[PDB]
């Protein structure tokens, strides 16, 4: 796993590119040894300048288009968060402005080299190089705002959540203090890590537990699935709903004791709002805090739960009571997807091990 944009280079501003290009053209012209006639020598120098400016600009710009992943090549989850962080449509257009600039400059180069190559009026030969420089600087200034934006989008994109996008992932939801992280830590092997996540205070915990030779990713959702989604901006809402493309199973934890600081009825409302936003992912309801919970509420919960067609698992994340029942259930739910993912990995590769 990694950040898809780590390879995206710093984008030079229109001025920096202009200066780099003119400077390089200046250097190449003085150390060039023209051929014969006085006018022929100036003409071959001016041609060299036009080509050097054209190449230096096109090479730097083209590097941006080549080293930045095409958004369509990214997993849906990242496409969603990329859009949240810098706006997908704006990104595509900025990039297209770069491609446009590369294209017009190539055309201008071919156009001006011909005019110069075909001239015999020193006055004109000079004026033509001067015009080309003028036009190159102008084309680059036309996209300067786009370049500046691409450089800022570059810095912002460094905060993409660093998580595994291939292996099955379990997403833990529920109100604050219901035991989400306690459960994630009881579930994972190595210590949890922290992934950055748009619209969260301190990010989210990311863990992993291995069964056989298969890996299962576990994440919790503080600041994301611990409060009414409706009471949210359409953007942070998009950031939250992006989890649809990462999660393969959602574990929803209820705290019947209400020690979390939320009445059972409020936890049920949240469960229903979350259960509805993720209709295409399987759910595993866990009733936590059984070690301190009152039988009274637990009856209402199981009742309510079973009425939604779900068979809950009673547990105590703190004391380990039932954790193995959860791990077991995770494995039973996700092992097939894990095998399918594994196969498809051997597939994709076999298809390029025979490159040609
Ligand atoms: N009595 C009891 N307390 C628990 C249990 N699980 C977690 N807690 C405590 O409840 C509080 C919140 O748990 P936490 O994992 O931080 O909740 P999150 O905000 O949903 O991640 C903590 O102080 C945990 O120690 C449990 O099974 N029984």
CATH code at 300?
Answer: 3.40.50.300
Sheet holding 214-220, edge to edge: 193-195, 204-211, 214-220, 169-173, 249-254, 283-287, 313-314
| Ligand 1 within 6 A of CB of 321 | no
CA-based nearest residue to 86, from 239, 240, 243? 239
Report CA(179)–ligand 1 centroid distance (Å). Answer: 4
Number of Cβ within 10 Å of residue 270's Cβ equals 21
Q: How many angstroms separate the CA atoms of 88 and 79, rounded?
A: 8
182 with 143, same domain?
Answer: no
| Ligand 1 within 6 A of CB of 182 | yes
Q: How many angstroms separate the CA atoms of 221 and 85, rounded?
A: 18
What does residue 299 show for φ and ψ, rounded to 5 degrees?
Answer: -70, -45
H or E, element range at 276: helix 264-277
Report CA(296)–ligand 1 centroid distance (Å). Answer: 20
Q: How many angstroms separate the CA atoms of 269 and 228, rounded?
A: 9
Domains of the chain: total: 2
DSSP annotation of 159 reads G
Report CA(110)–ligand 1 centroid distance (Å). Answer: 69
| Ligand 1 within 6 A of CB of 248 | no
Report CA(183)–ligand 1 centroid distance (Å). Answer: 8
CA-based nearest residue to 328, from 139, 101, 148, 170? 170
Substitution site in 175, 182, 314, 321 for ligand 1 pocket (most atoms within 8 Å of beta carbon) = 182
Report CA(81)–ligand 1 centroid distance (Å). Answer: 29
Q: Which atom of ligand 1 is nearest to the CA of 321?
A: 27
What does residue 192 show for φ and ψ, rounded to 5 degrees?
Answer: -65, 155
| Ligand 1 within 6 A of CB of 291 | yes
Beta bridge partners of 208: 217
Number of Cβ within 10 Å of residue 169's Cβ equals 23
149 with 186, same domain?
Answer: no
Number of Cβ within 10 Å of residue 30's Cβ equals 7
How far is residue 124 from each of residues 115, 118, 119, 317, measured CA to CA in Å? 9, 11, 7, 83
Q: How many angstroms separate the CA atoms of 209 and 189, rounded?
A: 5
Handedness of CA 44, 46, 51, 52 (dihedral sign): positive
Q: Which of 122, 146, 161 is the last residue of a domain?
A: 161
Q: Which of 113, 145, 161 is the last residue of a domain?
A: 161
CB-hemisphere CA count at 13 Å for 283? Answer: 24
| Ligand 1 within 6 A of CB of 174 | yes
Please enumerate in sequence order all residues whose Cβ is within 8 A of that of 322, keeping only pairs 6 or more positions apart, or say none. Answer: 286, 290, 313, 314, 315, 316
Contact predicate 54/106, CB 8 Å: yes
Annotated ligand binding at 291? The verdict is yes
| Ligand 1 within 6 A of CB of 317 | yes
Annotated ligand binding at 196? The verdict is no
CA-based nearest residue to 220, from 193, 255, 258? 193
56 with 96, same domain?
Answer: yes
| Ligand 1 within 6 A of CB of 289 | yes
CA angle 322, 323, 326 (to 5 degrees): 95
Q: Which domain holds residue 278?
A: 162-356
Report CA(44)–ligand 1 centroid distance (Å). Answer: 77
284 with 295, same domain?
Answer: yes
Q: What is the CATH number of the domain that holds 79?
A: 1.20.120.1190
Annotated ligand binding at 288? The verdict is yes
Q: How many angstroms separate the CA atoms of 220 and 203, rounded?
A: 10
169 with 133, same domain?
Answer: no
Going through the chain in order, the beta strands assigned E by DSSP cover 169-173, 193-195, 204-211, 214-220, 249-254, 283-287, 313-314
Annotated ligand binding at 178? The verdict is yes
Q: Which of 138, 161, 184 is the last residue of a domain?
A: 161
H or E, element range at 145: helix 144-156
The resolution in Å comes to 2.3
């Amino acid at each position: 796993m990694r950040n898809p944009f780590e390879r995206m280079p710093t984008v030079l501003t229109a001025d920096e590119l202009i200066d780099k290009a003119f400077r390089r053209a200046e250097k190449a012209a003085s150390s060039f040894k023209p051929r014969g006639n006085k006018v022929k020598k100036a003409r071959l120098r001016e041609e060299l300048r036009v080509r050097t400016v054209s190449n230096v600009v096109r090479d730097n710009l083209r590097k941006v288009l080549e080293r930045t992943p095409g958004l369509s090549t990214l997993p849906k989850f990242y496409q969603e968060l990329v859009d949240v962080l810098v706006d997908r449509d704006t990104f595509h257009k900025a990039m297209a402005g770069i491609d446009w600039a590369i294209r017009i400059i190539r055309e201008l180069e071919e156009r001006y080299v011909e005019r110069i190559r075909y001239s015999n009026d020193p006055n004109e030969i000079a004026e033509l190089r001067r015009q080309f420089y003028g036009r190159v600087a102008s084309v680059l200034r036309d996209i300067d705002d786009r370049l500046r934006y691409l450089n800022k989008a570059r810095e912002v994109l460094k905060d993409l959540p660093v998580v595994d996008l291939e292996i099955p992932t379990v997403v833990i939801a529920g109100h604050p203090n219901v035991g989400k992280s306690t459960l994630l830590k009881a579930l994972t092997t190595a210590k949890p890590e922290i992934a950055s996540y748009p619209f969260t205070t301190r990010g989210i915990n990311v863990g992993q537990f291995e069964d056989g030779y298969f890996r299962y990713q576990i994440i919790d959702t503080p600041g994301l699935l611990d409060r009414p989604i409706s009471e949210r901006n359409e953007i942070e809402k998009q950031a939250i709903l992006a989890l649809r493309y990462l999660g393969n199973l959602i574990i929803y934890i209820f705290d019947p004791s209400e020690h979390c600081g939320f009445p059972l009825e409020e936890q049920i409302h949240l469960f229903e709002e979350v259960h509805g936003e993720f209709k295409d992912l399987p759910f595993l309801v866990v009733i936590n805090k059984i070690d301190v919970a009152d039988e009274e509420n637990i009856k209402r919960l199981e009742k309510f739960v079973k009425e939604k067609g779900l068979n809950p698992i009673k547990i105590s994340a703190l004391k380990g009571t039932g954790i193995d029942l959860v791990k077991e259930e995770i494995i039973k739910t996700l092992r097939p997807l894990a095998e399918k993912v594994a196969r498809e990995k051997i597939e994709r590769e076999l298809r390029r091990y025979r490159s040609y």
